[PDB]
Amino acid sequence: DQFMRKRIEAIRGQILSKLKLTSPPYPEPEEVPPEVISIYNSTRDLLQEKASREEYYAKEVYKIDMPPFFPSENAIPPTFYRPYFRIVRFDVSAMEKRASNLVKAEFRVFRLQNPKARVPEQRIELYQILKSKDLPTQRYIDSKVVKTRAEGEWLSFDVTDAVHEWLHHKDRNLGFKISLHCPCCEELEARFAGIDGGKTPHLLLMLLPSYRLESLDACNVQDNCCLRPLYIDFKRDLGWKWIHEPKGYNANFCAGACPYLSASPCCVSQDLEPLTILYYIGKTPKIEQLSNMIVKSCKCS
């Protein structure tokens, strides 16, 4: 219908609202530096990965590559090798001024194809290296099961809390470690670009600008889209005496009106939680699980 014309107009406002631009902005598109396109290229590819399986306003994405090593200088290399783990370090001192606005950070490394891998499947673990003193020396972040012989792919980890300390205490930025999983009583056959040799390992820091920071659970009863209490007692409201327990559950329901512009509005359910019932047929007991029975929150869509 012509309500597509409204989706278009609702999208126009949704873009400027998340960016908090009262009006649209301009350079020339004939020559945009490739380094700028790489930041767009990595954020896109990241979300493409999550697709394959305070939140409203847009978030600025910053890309911090691996420090370039020049062997003629007096600099400690960014990478260190070991048959069972790799060590990588980033220099994130430029973002220390913006640490108060960081929301999420992800360390993205590309896993190359190792056609001559001994073990075809391995579990790798990501650690935040720590400065110890005497008798921990590392903190677990996340693990992943990778295919050492498969086609190359990008691997991402949520390293928000680790990068957070690095922006506060520069003397703790000791880097990451990609260790092979050990059952605690085999070599790391997984190769990564930039570590085992445009696929540079890099961090993707995502901030929420301050000007974008301003500066329906059980419903502040109201008559707009809002959760409403409903408790259904099986004997009372249904005449059912075959459910022995629960005697009744809060079913709830969504009701109200949402503003107009998002397309057209409806007050519907957002998240639902299952329900357990115990009933009987003959002398046989049935303890069963029914999904999507309890309305916990409402939304407009």
Partner: nanobody, 111 residues
Framework: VQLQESGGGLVQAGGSLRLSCAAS????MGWYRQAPGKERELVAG??????YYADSVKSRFTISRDNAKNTVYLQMNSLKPEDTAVYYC????????????WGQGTQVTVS
């Protein structure tokens, strides 16, 4: 701090040689190299028994350290005529990603 290197001389083409670097004072460590005319280059590096080797020395040179004796080694095997230079071992600055500490180092020339 103090850094003293030893080992090094003339070796037969294709031979081996073990350089040493002792730390007699008060820890990422590595080995540098400067050929006549050419600029410096980090050949090997040890740290957190973690290692960093250069591409021209990979699978030929080996770095090591005796945490008891505080000596860093450099096993130069399968030498080539291009590995001729003075080798300077270096230590890490107490808290920075610097080097700071160097030594005079010995010279090696392979025929």
């Amino acid at each position: 701090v103090q850094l003293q290197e030893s080992g090094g001389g003339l070796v037969q083409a294709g031979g081996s040689l073990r350089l040493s670097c002792a730390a007699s004072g008060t820890n990422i460590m590595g080995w540098y190299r400067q050929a006549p005319g050419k600029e410096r280059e980090l050949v090997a590096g040890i740290g957190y028994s973690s290692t960093y080797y250069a591409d021209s020395v990979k699978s030929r040179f080996t770095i090591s350290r005796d945490n008891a004796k505080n000596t860093v080694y450099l096993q130069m095997n399968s030498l080539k005529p291009e590995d001729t230079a003075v080798y300077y071992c270096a230590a890490q600055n107490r808290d920075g990603w610097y080097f700071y500490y160097w030594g005079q180092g010995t010279q090696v020339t392979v025929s």
